[PDB]
Curated annotation (Swiss-Prot), chain A:
Function recorded in the entry: Attaches the virion to the cell membrane by interacting with host receptor, initiating the infection. The major receptor is host ACE2. When S2/S2' has been cleaved, binding to the receptor triggers direct fusion at the cell membrane. When S2/S2' has not been cleaved, binding to the receptor results in internalization of the virus by endocytosis using host TFRC and GRM2 and leading to fusion of the virion membrane with the host endosomal membrane. Alternatively, may use NRP1/NRP2 and integrin as entry receptors.
Residues of the full protein shown: 159 to 207 of 1273
Region (Disordered): 15-27
Glycosylation site list: 7
Quaternary structure and interacting proteins, as annotated: Binds to host ACE2. RBD also interacts with the N-linked glycan on 'Asn-90' of ACE2. Cleavage of S generates a polybasic C-terminal sequence on S1 that binds to host Neuropilin-1 (NRP1) and Neuropilin-2 (NRP2) receptors. Interacts with host integrin alpha-5/beta-1 (ITGA5:ITGB1) and with ACE2 in complex with integrin alpha-5/beta-1 (ITGA5:ITGB1). May interact via cytoplasmic c-terminus with M protein. May interact (via N-terminus) with host bilirubin and biliverdin, thereby preventing antibody binding to the SARS-CoV-2 spike NTD via an allosteric mechanism.
Protein name: Spike protein S1
Gene that produces this protein: S
Amino acid sequence: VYSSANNCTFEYVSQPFLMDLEGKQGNFKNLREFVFKNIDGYFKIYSKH
Amino acid sequence: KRISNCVADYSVLYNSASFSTFKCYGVSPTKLNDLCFTNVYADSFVIRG
Ligand SMILES: *[C@@H]1O[C@H](CO)[C@@H](O)[C@H](O)[C@H]1NC(C)=O
């Protein structure tokens, strides 16, 4: 995903989340929506499954 | 290094009773914890005596 990172700031770790790494070709069963906003430099994340 | 989305008491960083020297200007050492700032920059390096 990248080679290396320079001098930087703001490293945050959120709560753990489990996934399934097996991919199929069937019909979908869940829907995930995400909204990313940036007001006055302040990052916003809105989501619901 | 910079800390954000976190909280801290520097009292544990003081009662170690192992630091040979200590210097802090601009604010009193005993009344800096209640005073609130935005970000804290940590600048770590080695130097001779
Ligand atoms: C360290 O990071 C800051 C931004 O957080 C940047 O402005 C500065 O240039 C960086 N220092 C070096 C040596 O890259």
